[PDB]
Amino acid sequence: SCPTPWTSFQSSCYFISTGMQSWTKSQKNCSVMGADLVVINTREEQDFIIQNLKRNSSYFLGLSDPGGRRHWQWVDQTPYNENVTFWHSGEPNNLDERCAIINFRSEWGWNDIHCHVPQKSICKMKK
Amino acid sequence: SCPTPWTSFQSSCYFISTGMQSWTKSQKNCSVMGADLVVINTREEQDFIIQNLKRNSSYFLGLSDPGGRRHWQWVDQTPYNENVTFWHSGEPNNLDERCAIINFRSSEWGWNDIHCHVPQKSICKMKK
Numbered sequence: 001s002c003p004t005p006w007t008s009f010q011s012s013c014y015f016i017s018t019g020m021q022s023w024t025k026s027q028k029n030c031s032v033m034g035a036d037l038v039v040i041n042t043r044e045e046q047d048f049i050i051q052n053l054k055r056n057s058s059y060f061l062g063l064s065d066p067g068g069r070r071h072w073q074w075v076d077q078t079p080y081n082e083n084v085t086f087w088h089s090g091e092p093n094n095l096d097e098r099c100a101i102i103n104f105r106s107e108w109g110w111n112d113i114h115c116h117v118p119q120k121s122i123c124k125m126k127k
Numbered sequence: 128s129c130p131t132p133w134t135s136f137q138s139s140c141y142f143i144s145t146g147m148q149s150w151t152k153s154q155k156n157c158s159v160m161g162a163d164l165v166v167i168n169t170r171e172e173q174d175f176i177i178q179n180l181k182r183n184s185s186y187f188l189g190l191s192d193p194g195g196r197r198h199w200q201w202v203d204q205t206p207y208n209e210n211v212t213f214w215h216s217g218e219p220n221n222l223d224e225r226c227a228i229i230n231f232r233s234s235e236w237g238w239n240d241i242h243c244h245v246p247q248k249s250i251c252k253m254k255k
Contacts, residue, residue: 027202039201046213062202070225070240071198074166075154075189086173088232092240095222098197105215112197112219 002127009048013125014038016052017059020118023099026060030123037062038122049122050108058103060121061110067095128255136175140253141165143179144186147246150226153187157251164189165250176229176250177236185230187249188238194222 002013015035017026027037039062040046053059070092072080099115102108102122113119129140142162144153154164166189167173180186197219199207226243229236229250241247 036202039203039205040213041205043211063199063207064202065197065199070192072190072192072227075163075191076166078166078168080190084170086167086229086237088237088239091238092225092227098219100199100219102213109213109215110218111215 002125006125007052008127009045011127013127014049014052015123015125017121017123020120022118023060023064023115026119026121027062030062030121033123033125035123035125038124039063046108049102053102053104053108053122055104058101058119060119061100061102062124063100063110064115065095065098067097070095129253133253134179135255136172138255140255141176141179142251142253144249144251147248149246150187150191150243153247153249154189157189157249160251160253162251162253165252166190173236180229180231180236180250182231185228185247187247188227188229189252190227190238191243192222192225194224197222 002008006013006015015033017029021029023037030036037060038049040049069082074080097115098112100110101113101119102110129135133140133142142157142160144156148156150164157164164187165176167176196209201207224243225240227238228241228247229238
């Protein structure tokens with residue numbers, strides 16, 4: 001009961017992109033189709049996904065680190081409280097974003113990557 | 128009642144280094160003296176510290192990010208659980224460390240983040 005270009009597993013529909021776009025644009029592409037970049041909840045889901053991928057291809061997952069604030073720690077384990085700090089204006093530097101891909105090494109598994117690189121992607125639509 | 132080269136404030140002793148070393152070596156230097164790189168708990172402590180620093184100098188604080196694992200998130204807010212992942216061996220990349228300094232800018236005193244291996248002066252705090 002999934003749209004034609006989609007494949008069903010359990011009560012979800014999956015779309016394997018053919019285009020290469022950044023993580024943000026890939027998520028947008030999933031979004032307008034009523035989907036998200038793929039969230040892998042179970043081992044069975046990972047196995048189904050890899051049976052629908054091409055070994056010569058790399059795909060964005062719906063897994064990322066948005067970056068932003070670092071998890072600062074005092075050296076004596078005094079709790080760090082952001083609200084009582086004395087950072088100079090515009091400090092400290094924001095942590096950069098990072099994104100995850102699934103691909104095949106000669107097997108299948110995840111790797112981290114810059115979010116702005118063009119990769120293929122996997123969308124999941126809840127059915 | 129602090130050792131001679133140290134200054135007292137409340138029930139703590141403070142040492143202002145003259146030497147420039149990495150964060151790790153600065154912490155080690157504090158450690159062998161029975162101290163830590165300075166942890167700033169209160170506003171009065173920050174004010175006392177800045178009254179004992181030189182405006183042309185930058186000093187490591189006992190504040191850092193050890194790096195390591197990133198705080199990964201699923202796009203639909205499913206909790207990320209590291210124990211049920213499929214990362215390739217040696218993946219993902221560790222986040223790099225970062226360290227904090229106190230120094231003076233024209234218009235005044237405040238903290239900045241910095242690479243941990245840069246030589247800076249340092250402040251030690253000893254519990255009395």
